[PDB]
Write a protein that binds this ligand. Structure first.
Ligand code: HEM
Ligand SMILES: Clc1ccccc1C(c1ccccc1)(c1ccccc1)n1ccnc1
Length: 424
């Protein structure tokens, strides 16, 4: 696991280490002061050299210059500020219904299989859930993957992500499948763009959402390619990392009984057996909140980010040449005993009330101007999903399932988190 190699080198060779990552020289930077310096200033910006890979894959245009992959400050600032509107307090509150609907549906589907003997992939289940939530919430569309629909669409996402991996970590069947899948994704967008426009044209009233803001950001452009870049971007960013995080959380909890009991007790105190979770109910799921923060420390789906160091600089008593991609890793810093006591122990008490917040040693949603636009969105959906599962279902990992990670485009469980389930 590449990230675990970086961890070793970080601990042995100190806070500034030259590496080869995605075929390039970069320098991994692991002091909290360096994380603060570079990530908390609009001065430093993403390295296009590292983000080019994501713009186009095997010749086929993918995320282009969408909100994630755009590295020029001014160009990203113009899109971020218009798209920010789709993430206001009251926009996210408007999504609680989607969040509750999909969560409820997931649980019933699992409840129908809850005999203690039917192996279910919590990875796939959680993936379908996040995708269904994203599609409705952001785009006003219903994929219904939870109901077995859109099998080709999920096949297409699967091959695209395998494609990302292959293309940046060092086969002709795959190559066509992958190009095919990326085109499929972009066509799905072209479609859902027509659908929206066609509703507006006949003068229907469409509640403001994410799609609204990315059309709006594209107003005054000769074509729709920037629009689709952004459609594919949110399509993927808005579900894959949430699903990874949900899958890791469930995987870890299966060997954490004391913690689950306490999670069950909390759910029982603040919501009991209530069916629909209001906004104000999430705020009070304090212990669940800690478990989730702790899941992200050990298992961040998005392990880090790159900033371009434009000029030779002294970082932690090491001269670093100009034009150097700086690598930051919350995965690495999360596992260093110098920042976290007993780093390998899953202990949600680290995030308890009273405990000093981690000081630039923990950034699962990144930091500063290029941090995750979807943070609050994600935190809400996973709480809703996790709370529902904690109310109703008990999980048991299938013997011979592993607890390890694989680095694909993001960090995800090695094994698909196969479980048998039981009503609570
Ligand atoms: C547990 C879930 C999630 C995690 C851990 C996560 C993590 C991250 C991180 C680390 C970044 C910075 C990436 C980089 O520097 O290359 C990022 C960016 C981004 N994520 Fe998330 N994210 C998650 C969920 C979401 C959701 C739910 C959405 C959409 C609703 C979303 C949309 C975005 C977008 C558009 C950006 C680019 C932001 C910008 O640079 O202005 N993500 N995410
Ligand atoms: Cl390319 C990808 C696939 C699946 C999930 C996330 C990403 C992505 C990313 C960012 C930096 C380095 C590798 C992958 C991503 C990059 C560009 C466009 C969309 C998603 N991402 C991480 C967090 N949010 C989005």
């Amino acid at each position: 696991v590449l990230q675990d190699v970086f961890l070793d080198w970080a601990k042995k060779y100190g806070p500034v280490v030259r590496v080869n990552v995605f075929h390039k020289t970069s320098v991994i930077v692991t002091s909290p002061e360096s994380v603060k310096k570079f990530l908390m200033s609009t001065k430093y910006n993403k390295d296009s050299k590292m983000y080019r890979a994501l713009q186009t894959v095997f010749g086929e245009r993918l995320f282009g210059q969408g909100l994630v992959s755009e590295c020029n400050y001014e160009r990203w600032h113009k899109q971020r500020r218009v798209i920010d509107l789709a993430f206001s307090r009251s926009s996210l509150v408007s999504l609680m219904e989607t969040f509750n609907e999909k969560a409820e549906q997931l649980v019933e589907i699992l409840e129908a299989k809850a005999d203690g003997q039917t192996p279910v992939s919590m990875q796939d289940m959680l993936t379908y859930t996040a995708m269904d939530i994203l599609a409705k919430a952001a785009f006003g569309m219903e994929t219904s993957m939870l109901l077995g629909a859109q099998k080709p669409l999920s096949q297409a996402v699967k091959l695209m992500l395998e494609g990302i991996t292959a293309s940046r970590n060092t086969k002709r069947k795959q190559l066509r499948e992958v190009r095919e899948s990326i085109r499929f994704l972009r066509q799905v967008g072209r479609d859902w763009v027509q659908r929206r426009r066609e509703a507006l044209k006949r003068g229907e009233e469409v509640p403001a959402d994410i799609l609204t803001q990315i059309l709006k950001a594209e107003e005054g452009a000769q074509d729709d390619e920037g629009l689709l870049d952004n459609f594919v971007t949110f399509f993927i960013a808005g579900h894959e990392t949430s699903a990874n995080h949900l899958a890791f959380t469930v995987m870890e909890l299966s060997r954490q009984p004391e913690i689950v009991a306490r999670l069950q007790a909390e759910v029982d105190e603040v919501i009991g057996s209530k069916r629909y979770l209001d906004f104000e109910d999430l705020g009070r799921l304090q212990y669940l909140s800690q478990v989730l923060k702790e899941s992200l420390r050990l298992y961040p789906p998005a392990w880090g980010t790159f900033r371009l160091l434009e000029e030779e600089t002294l970082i932690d008593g090491v001269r670093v040449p100009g034009n150097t991609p700086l690598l930051f890793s919350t995965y690495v810093m999360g596992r260093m005993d110098t920042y976290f006591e007993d780093p390998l122990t899953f202990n949600p008490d680290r995030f308890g009330p009273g405990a000093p917040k981690p000081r630039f040693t923990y950034f699962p949603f990144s930091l500063g101007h290029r941090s995750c636009i979807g943070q609050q969105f994600a935190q809400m959906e996973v709480k809703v999903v996790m709370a529902k599962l904690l109310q109703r279902l008990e999980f048991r990992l299938v013997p011979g399932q592993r607890f390890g990670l694989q680095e694909q485009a993001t960090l995800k469980p090695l094994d698909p988190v196969l479980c048998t389930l039981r009503p609570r």
